[PDB]
Design an enzyme around this catalytic site. Structure first.
Site, PDB file in Angstrom:
ATOM      1  N   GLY A   1       0.802  -1.204   0.000  1.00 56.40           N
ATOM      2  CA  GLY A   1       0.000   0.000   0.000  1.00 56.40           C
ATOM      3  C   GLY A   1       0.840   1.262   0.000  1.00 56.40           C
TER       4      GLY A   1
ATOM      5  CD  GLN B   1       3.833   7.986  -0.082  1.00 53.74           C
ATOM      6  OE1 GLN B   1       3.567   8.622  -1.102  1.00 53.74           O
ATOM      7  NE2 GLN B   1       3.415   8.357   1.124  1.00 53.74           N
TER       8      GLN B   1
ATOM      9  CD  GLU C   1      -2.497   4.175  -6.504  1.00 53.39           C
ATOM     10  OE1 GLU C   1      -2.341   4.659  -7.646  1.00 53.39           O
ATOM     11  OE2 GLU C   1      -1.918   4.624  -5.493  1.00 53.39           O
TER      12      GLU C   1
ATOM     13  N   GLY D   1      -5.764   1.883   5.257  1.00 55.29           N
ATOM     14  CA  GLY D   1      -5.976   1.704   3.837  1.00 55.29           C
ATOM     15  C   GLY D   1      -6.643   0.381   3.514  1.00 55.29           C
TER      16      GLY D   1
ATOM     17  CB  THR E   1      -4.007  -1.759  -0.629  1.00 56.14           C
ATOM     18  OG1 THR E   1      -4.820  -1.457  -1.769  1.00 56.14           O
ATOM     19  CG2 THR E   1      -2.893  -2.708  -1.046  1.00 56.14           C
TER      20      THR E   1
ATOM     21  CG  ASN F   1       0.382   8.210  10.698  1.00 60.58           C
ATOM     22  OD1 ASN F   1       1.593   8.000  10.646  1.00 60.58           O
ATOM     23  ND2 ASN F   1      -0.439   7.901   9.705  1.00 60.58           N
TER      24      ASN F   1
ATOM     25  CD  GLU G   1      20.492 -12.823  23.009  1.00 60.23           C
ATOM     26  OE1 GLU G   1      21.187 -13.318  22.098  1.00 60.23           O
ATOM     27  OE2 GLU G   1      20.983 -12.285  24.024  1.00 60.23           O
TER      28      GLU G   1
HETATM   29  N1  LIG Z   1       2.696   7.203   8.370  1.00 61.92           N
HETATM   30  C1  LIG Z   1       2.174   7.233   7.147  1.00 61.92           C
HETATM   31  N2  LIG Z   1       0.858   6.863   6.949  1.00 61.92           N
HETATM   32  C2  LIG Z   1       0.315   6.889   5.709  1.00 61.92           C
HETATM   33  C3  LIG Z   1       1.081   7.289   4.623  1.00 61.92           C
HETATM   34  N3  LIG Z   1       0.307   7.223   3.519  1.00 61.92           N
HETATM   35  C4  LIG Z   1      -0.924   6.796   3.878  1.00 61.92           C
HETATM   36  N4  LIG Z   1      -0.935   6.576   5.230  1.00 61.92           N
HETATM   37  C5  LIG Z   1      -2.099   6.111   6.005  1.00 61.92           C
HETATM   38  O1  LIG Z   1      -2.940   5.321   5.182  1.00 61.92           O
HETATM   39  C6  LIG Z   1      -4.305   5.614   5.436  1.00 61.92           C
HETATM   40  C7  LIG Z   1      -4.991   5.978   4.123  1.00 61.92           C
HETATM   41  O2  LIG Z   1      -5.025   4.796   3.364  1.00 61.92           O
HETATM   42  P1  LIG Z   1      -3.897   4.374   2.300  1.00 61.92           P
HETATM   43  O3  LIG Z   1      -2.534   4.194   2.917  1.00 61.92           O
HETATM   44  O4  LIG Z   1      -3.878   5.391   1.181  1.00 61.92           O
HETATM   45  O5  LIG Z   1      -4.521   2.999   1.749  1.00 61.92           O
HETATM   46  P2  LIG Z   1      -3.699   1.974   0.825  1.00 61.92           P
HETATM   47  O6  LIG Z   1      -2.973   1.007   1.729  1.00 61.92           O
HETATM   48  O7  LIG Z   1      -2.736   2.709  -0.077  1.00 61.92           O
HETATM   49  O8  LIG Z   1      -4.800   1.175  -0.040  1.00 61.92           O
HETATM   50  P3  LIG Z   1      -6.149   1.870  -0.580  1.00 61.92           P
HETATM   51  O9  LIG Z   1      -7.307   1.690   0.377  1.00 61.92           O
HETATM   52  O10 LIG Z   1      -6.469   1.285  -1.934  1.00 61.92           O
HETATM   53  O11 LIG Z   1      -5.854   3.338  -0.769  1.00 61.92           O
HETATM   54  C8  LIG Z   1      -4.361   6.749   6.445  1.00 61.92           C
HETATM   55  O12 LIG Z   1      -4.740   6.272   7.713  1.00 61.92           O
HETATM   56  C9  LIG Z   1      -2.945   7.284   6.485  1.00 61.92           C
HETATM   57  O13 LIG Z   1      -2.605   7.689   7.786  1.00 61.92           O
HETATM   58  C10 LIG Z   1       2.406   7.663   4.811  1.00 61.92           C
HETATM   59  O14 LIG Z   1       3.092   8.020   3.855  1.00 61.92           O
HETATM   60  N5  LIG Z   1       2.949   7.633   6.078  1.00 61.92           N
HETATM   61 MG   LIG Z   2      -3.621   3.313  -2.259  1.00 60.21          MG
HETATM   62 MG   LIG Z   3      24.065 -16.308  23.279  1.00 60.82          MG
END
Ligand SMILES: Nc1nc2c(ncn2[C@@H]2O[C@H](COP(=O)(O)OP(=O)(O)OP(=O)(O)O)[C@@H](O)[C@H]2O)c(=O)[nH]1
Ligand SMILES: [Mg+2]
Ligand SMILES: [Mg+2]
Ligand SMILES: Nc1nc2c(ncn2[C@@H]2O[C@H](COP(=O)(O)OP(=O)(O)O)[C@@H](O)[C@H]2O)c(=O)[nH]1
Ligand SMILES: COc1cccc(-c2cc(NCc3ccc4[nH]ccc4c3)nc(N)n2)c1
Ligand SMILES: [Ca+2]
Ligand SMILES: [Ca+2]
Ligand SMILES: [Ca+2]
Lengths: 440, 425
Positions: free
Chosen positions: A10, A15, A71, A143, A145, A206, A254
């Site tokens: 995801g 990232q 995606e 997310g 995904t 976060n 450990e």
């Molecule tokens: N710490 C951190 N959290 C992120 C980041 N990008 C997205 N998130 C978290 O992801 C959530 C939003 O969903 P996505 O990460 O976009 O979902 P996905 O796993 O890409 O899959 P989809 O549902 O298809 O978008 C939010 O709760 C965000 O806090 C990032 O770059 N850093």
């Molecule tokens: Mg996504």
């Molecule tokens: Mg040892």
């Protein structure tokens, strides 16, 4: 030998993987083209860094990683970014339509079409390992995904690689950046589905990372780049034991023995210090005692919770840089005499310590100052259940009205999966309460 | 009368390496295996621990075992790395992860046969095998789990040979992991049945000695192993050098072990080192009976001595040691059982250890060793009553009654020590 395969699922996972592997390359002196002048063993080796990097005959050091997203826009930035050359194209896997923040689409509808390809690409990495240790899975709870497909993957990895170990780095949703009302639903569904398949999961709130960037780096409004670069430091400290070696280096495994008394109780709380801007760091070098004290200030935790109002089951300190045992033991002694550190009655109160001499590195142009020593504390505290409680409460508010549930039912899920998952969380919250009671 | 040495695990191989370094120096053997000594007394019993190879080279009769290659590679690179027979390195790749079950049942079982093969080749080349000695820890997985597995296998093929061990007991003050009480309790039950002598080296005492007495603020495992190697050298001096003492492993066991299960000894050493002032015979005897010089964290005045053996090294008045040895008897006469007459032994070796004009090694079979097993039993039950960290073991196939059985056997061992501590004539 003892290789680890990282899986980034995801947007959040990918990232964060970008920031982590960027940091790894800097710590090991690997260039964006994969070349590492200091490695004289061309095309192979049994160095500590070879646990995360394989070698080609041409001298390229390739991450043992797989990036996956339903995606392509996020992984496309990797395919054209500074470190495109680092990864072989087959390691970057993309679908065409995402899960639209729907656990069902990530686990069933859309995940179903790509799961076999991912497993086959993961198998190609495992076949390159002489003694594969386990997996590191990076993903978000919120997310579609990050939650749904990760659950499917974890289930399938337990089948293809028996009990081979699997560690999670999970992004806990915070309203300051969470742009999705349904993230509580996805969080409980995925935590329930992976619980039996995860040996150890490191949760990152976060909101906690957000506040740390605002408080200690004086960033008015941090971005995902700010959050991820900080997250990479915590990830690096946890994995430094596997990528470097030394006489005071303790393997993460450990530490894991001490951190998981019961299979379900495998959610350590991470605390990191120092997080300091270069403006403050100038003419203010922090000592071993100062950073160790910071490990017990809740404002430095990866997850918002109050250890003072819980009980400890384990306390691990992972130092990296200019640190020697004498200073560590002195600092721990002072902390024991000043702070609220209560262990459960059924485990010893000692602190397990490890030291890496390779000092911390920072990304060029970042906000973190380069420091001579740093520490990450891993603690098994019952207070971590507060995070489950907040999340379960938000789940109950929406599910009582079945709000948004039709989006999941429309993709083939049943109401029973919701109640089944919620009940597992209720037991988990009760398990944490049980472990903290005194014996008889 | 040859001895076969085995060192298993991280702790076992490091204290084992120091041991071979120390006695190799005493016997005049260099890191390459060539003899450059001054006296023929060094060689008269070199065969006890060394094979004579082609080129007048001497090779330790030692086998090196571990489930991960890390420590063994360090040993092959260490000072005396090149002296061991290369085919005597037997290692696995995965490791035991400080898990007794992995060393005893799953990972160790995979490698144990390969280890016994090297044992046979060493034993077949023995004119008259005298017994085995094992160096290992009880808190880890390889030395603890697989080490006891090896002992059980050796007693199968060599049931009439003596099996002794130098066993390092875990302590929270020097702890790598929390499941150490589990592994120790499972190992001791094996040692109660399948060993003739077990020298209980307690890391708690080694730390207290390095810190309190030697005034070392930050003791390392190397500092503790300096004490262990010095003691093992002192214990083995009765066999390694030629006095008018005809000492064999079985004869020594017969004289020290009045009951089969009570064969856990407290080692001791004096002077304690890490100065040039010549130490006096009264000082050597007074220190070696002091609790501060004991390698097991137990108070000898809290129990009673079944048997005692004191070994003196250096050129001193054999008359004066007897006078002081007879003197100390009165100062602790209440702490010696009166139903084993003349239960204190004294031996003298003219050859001193390195950089010491006079030394003394203490071997005591005291019922106060019971204090150690209670300590481990408490740490065991503190977790077991809540079934904490058991999943690490049940995941490898162990049932919980095996933990309960091991617990009961150690509590039985404690009770057996108590009956003889209160027994009178
Ligand atoms: N710490 C951190 N959290 C992120 C980041 N990008 C997205 N998130 C978290 O992801 C959530 C939003 O969903 P996505 O990460 O976009 O979902 P996905 O796993 O890409 O899959 P989809 O549902 O298809 O978008 C939010 O709760 C965000 O806090 C990032 O770059 N850093
Ligand atoms: Mg996504
Ligand atoms: Mg040892
Ligand atoms: N004296 C000493 N004890 C050690 C050393 N290394 C480990 N130990 C002890 O052994 C326990 C850890 O077991 P370990 O050595 O890892 O067992 P292994 O897995 O078989 O090698 C700890 O409780 C220590 O007290 C060492 O170098 N010296
Ligand atoms: C672990 O492997 C070994 C290897 C070598 C020696 C020993 C050892 C030494 C020892 N000390 C000297 C002694 C003690 C009582 C005596 N009685 C008559 C002579 C006599 C001599 N005592 C015992 N039991 N073993 C154990
Ligand atoms: Ca290499
Ligand atoms: Ca195997
Ligand atoms: Ca065979």
């Amino acid at each position: 030998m003892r290789e680890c395969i990282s899986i980034h699922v995801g947007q959040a996972g990918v990232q964060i993987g970008n920031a982590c592997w960027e940091l790894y390359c800097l710590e090991h002196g690997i260039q964006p083209d994969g070349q590492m002048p200091s490695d004289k063993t061309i095309g192979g080796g049994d160095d500590s860094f070879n646990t995360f990097f394989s070698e080609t005959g041409a001298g390229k050091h390739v991450p043992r990683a797989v990036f996956v997203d339903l995606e392509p826009t996020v992984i496309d930035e990797v395919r054209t970014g500074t470190y495109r050359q680092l990864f072989h194209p087959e390691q970057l896997i993309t679908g065409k339509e995402d899960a639209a923040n729907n656990y069902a689409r990530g686990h069933y509808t859309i995940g179903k079409e790509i799961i076999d390809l991912v497993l086959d690409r993961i198998r190609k990495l495992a076949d390159q390992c002489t003694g594969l240790q386990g997996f590191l899975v990076f993903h978000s709870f919120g997310g579609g995904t990050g939650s749904g497909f990760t659950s499917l993957l974890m289930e399938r990895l337990s089948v293809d690689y028996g009990k081979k170990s699997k560690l999670e780095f999970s992004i806990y949703p915070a309203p300051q950046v969470s742009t999705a009302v349904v993230e509580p639903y996805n969080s409980i569904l995925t935590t329930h589905t992976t619980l039996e398949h995860s040996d150890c999961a490191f949760m990152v709130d976060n909101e906690a990372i957000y506040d740390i960037c605002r408080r200690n780096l004086d960033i008015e409004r941090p971005t995902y780049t700010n959050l991820n670069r900080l997250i990479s430091q915590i990830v690096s400290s946890i994995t430094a034991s596997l990528r470097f070696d030394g006489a005071l280096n303790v393997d993460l495994t450990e530490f894991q023995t001490n951190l998981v008394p019961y299979p379900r109780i495998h959610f350590p709380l991470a605390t990191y210090a120092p997080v300091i801007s270069a403006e403050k760091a100038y003419h203010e070098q922090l000592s071993v005692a100062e950073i160790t004290n910071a490990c017990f200030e809740p404002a430095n935790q990866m997850v918002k919770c109050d250890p003072r109002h819980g009980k400890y089951m384990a306390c691990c300190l992972l130092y990296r840089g200019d640190v020697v045992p004498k200073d560590v033991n002195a600092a721990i002694a002072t902390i024991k005499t000043k702070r609220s550190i209560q262990f459960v009655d059924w485990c010893p109160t000692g602190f397990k310590v490890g030291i890496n001499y390779q000092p911390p590195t920072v990304v060029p142009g970042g906000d973190l100052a380069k420091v001579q020593r740093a520490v990450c504390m891993l603690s098994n505290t019952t207070a971590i259940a507060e995070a489950w409680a907040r999340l379960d409460h938000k789940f109950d508010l929406m599910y009582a009205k079945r709000a948004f549930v039709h989006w999941y039912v429309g993709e083939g899920m049943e109401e029973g999966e919701f109640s089944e998952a919620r009940e597992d969380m209720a037991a988990l919250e009760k398990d944490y309460e049980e472990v903290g009671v005194d014996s008889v | 009368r040859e001895i076969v040495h085995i060192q298993a695990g991280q702790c076992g191989n490091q204290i084992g390496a120091k041991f071979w370094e120390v006695i190799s120096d005493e016997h005049g053997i260099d890191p390459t295996g060539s003899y450059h000594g001054d006296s023929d007394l060094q060689l008269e019993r070199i065969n006890v621990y060394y094979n004579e190879a082609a080129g007048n080279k001497y090779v330790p009769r030692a086998i090196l075992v571990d489930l991960e290659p890390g420590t063994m590679d360090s040993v092959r690179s260490g000072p005396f790395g090149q002296i061991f027979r290369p085919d005597n390195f037997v290692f696995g790749q995965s490791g035991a992860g400080n898990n007794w079950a992995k060393g005893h049942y799953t990972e160790g079982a995979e490698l144990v046969d390969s280890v016994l093969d090297v044992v046979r080749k060493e034993s077949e080349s023995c004119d008259c095998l005298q017994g085995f000695q094992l160096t290992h820890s009880l808190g880890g997985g390889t030395g603890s789990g697989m080490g006891t597995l090896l002992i059980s296998k050796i007693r199968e093929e060599y049931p009439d040979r003596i099996m002794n061990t130098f066993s390092v007991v875990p302590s929270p003050k020097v702890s790598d992991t929390v499941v150490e009480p589990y592994n120790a309790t499972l190992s001791v039950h094996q040692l109660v049945e399948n060993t003739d002598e077990t020298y209980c080296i307690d890391n708690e005492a080694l730390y207290d000695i390095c810190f309190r007495t030697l005034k070392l603020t930050t003791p390392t495992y190397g500092d503790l192993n300096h004490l262990v190697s010095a003691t093992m050298s002192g214990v083995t001096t009765c066999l390694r050098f030629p006095g008018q003492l005809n000492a064999d492993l079985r004869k020594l066991a017969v004289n020290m072990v009045p009951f089969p299960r009570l064969h856990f000894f407290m080692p001791g050493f004096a002077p304690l080192t890490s100065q040039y002032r010549a130490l006096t015979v009264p000082e050597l005897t007074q220190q070696m009976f002091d609790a501060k010089n004991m390698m097991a964290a137990c108070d000898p005045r809290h129990g009673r001595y079944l048997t005692v053996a004191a070994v003196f090294r250096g050129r001193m008045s054999m008359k004066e040691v007897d006078e002081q040895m007879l003197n100390v008897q009165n100062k602790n006469s209440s702490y010696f059982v009166e139903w084993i007459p003349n239960n204190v032994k004294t031996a003298v070796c003219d050859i001193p250890p390195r950089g010491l004009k006079m030394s003394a090694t203490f071997i005591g079979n005291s019922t106060a060793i019971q204090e150690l097993f209670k300590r481990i039993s408490e740490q065991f039950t503190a977790m077991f009553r809540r079934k904490a960290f058991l999943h690490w073991y049940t995941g490898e196939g162990m049932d919980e009654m095996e933990f309960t059985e091991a617990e009961s056997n150690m509590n039985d061992l404690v009770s057996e020590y108590q009956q003889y501590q209160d027994a009178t004539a």
